[PDB]
Amino acid sequence: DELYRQSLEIISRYLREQATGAKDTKGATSRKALETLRRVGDGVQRNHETAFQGMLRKLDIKNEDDVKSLSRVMIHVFSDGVTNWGRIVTLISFGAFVAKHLKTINQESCIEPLAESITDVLVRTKRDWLVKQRGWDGFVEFFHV
């Protein structure tokens, strides 16, 4: 399952670098997807800091493993039947915001359960939608500037 593997790698790397404040070393689309995610993921968090803080408070995540409510939230987001990259990137960006807060309470927190939770909603529930547009190329091109 290359799409799942690729998606988990991109999302994990973003969440990890957001949470630690440092980048990782060592495909071409994955690199470009990550650069795009950095740019647009940082962008969504801007202007929406107050809203993200508010959502984090309501989420009331107890620890690094407490991802059930976030998964439920993400399923609910898509439950109007609409799928687009602005929603997807916002979900990933909020995941980054949450990963950051987990590191503040406990420095040795794995961001991986959160990243798996998001990748799972994305890849499992939007599988054919993603495949149709060559996966992350859809994302790269949508946000291309």
Partner: peptide, 23 residues
């Protein structure tokens, strides 16, 4: 919900805004 409904509403709002901005 109700917290989970509110979080979802908010994420959807920002996501559609952000989609619209680039579309």
């Amino acid at each position: 919900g109700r917290p989970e409904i509110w979080i979802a509403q908010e994420l959807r709002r920002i996501g559609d805004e952000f989609n619209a901005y680039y579309a």
